[PDB]
């Protein structure tokens with residue numbers, strides 16, 4: 154006449170803070186580059202474009 | 203629930219079950235221990251060796 158009620162559930166492990174995978178949806182974005190330019194007697198200059 | 207020595211009617215130990223209630227210290231809610239009655243949650247214990 155005795156009864157044992159068993160319970161169990163899933164939760165994130167401790168490693169999940171450091172060892173996890175990020176699922177991203179990717180859409181067409183932007184394109185950037187760093188260009189190095191020199192002309193005449195002007196020394197090399199660069200900037201993000 | 204008796205707080206002092208009690209003499210029961212029964213004559214044979216096998217006829218009775220005695221459960222010790224001593225809550226001075228708490229225990230981890232291990233899946234290998236029978237749960238107590240009511241809100242048995244008493245506190246939190248930090249995990250010492252966390253992943254880093």
Ligand SMILES: *[C@@H]1O[C@H](CO)[C@@H](O)[C@H](O)[C@H]1NC(C)=O
Nearest residue numbers: 187188189190197198199200
């Ligand atoms: C641009 O070119 C010159 C070539 O001597 C170099 O010294 C300079 O570091 C370059 N710029 C960058 C951002 O690397």
